[PDB]
Design a binder for this molecule. Structure first.
Ligand code: NA
Ligand code: NA
Lengths: 127, 118
């Protein structure tokens, strides 16, 4: 529910992900993320959001499909995880990597890990 | 099963990834601060702009290649949340019809439907 104190103060750091996912694997992907999400929260994540292409324009210089070298059978996913600080983000990711829960239902990735793009970013505007 | 939740719960997100000259960070922040109130007025739930902090280089793809970033530039990861595609479309149409520090063509942009929000 809306809470202006949490809204104002909670997030300071974001891990952003852009993924190419086979279109027929939408459900598999959603299920994987639904399994991962509570784990990230356990480790200090504030929120995990995964968004499936709806209206993604094609360009000649750059575009979201070019960014993940998307193949004809694939759709672009735009996703992120919100954290209270870089330090919590770092701790969470280290934990995730040492968790057998994501060793299992996590190594069956319904997408090409090589083409995923990823980075940590500091919040500069959040309104 | 609750069809009211099913139909309404998930938000619609316009995602933006932008190459911005590193020396224009404040200019970029103040631009976004100015635009935010207008997007909210038009129906946005939230506007977020994030500046590169730990963005690894890759050989296949990475955030810098995604916006064909130049040596003097950093990557911004940004989004705007809406209740639905319809509000998103209305808000952007208002932006195009109505109102009032980065390489606009290299920016990548798209509308996306949230499928997980936890
Ligand atoms: Na293109
Ligand atoms: Na580490």
């Amino acid at each position: 529910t809306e809470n202006l104190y949490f809204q104002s103060n909670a997030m300071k750091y974001v891990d952003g992900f852009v993924v190419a996912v086979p279109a027929d694997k939408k459900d598999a992907y959603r299920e994987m993320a639904a399994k991962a999400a509570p784990l990230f929260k356990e480790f200090g994540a504030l929120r995990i959001v995964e968004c499936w292409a709806s209206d993604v324009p094609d360009g000649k210089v750059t575009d979201f499909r070019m960014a993940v070298k998307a193949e004809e059978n694939e759709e672009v996913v735009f996703s992120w995880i919100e954290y209270p600080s870089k330090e919590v983000r770092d701790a969470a990711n280290q934990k995730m990597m040492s968790d057998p829960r994501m060793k299992e239902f996590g190594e069956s990735m319904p997408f090409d890990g090589k083409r995923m793009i990823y980075g940590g970013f500091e919040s500069i505007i959040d309104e």
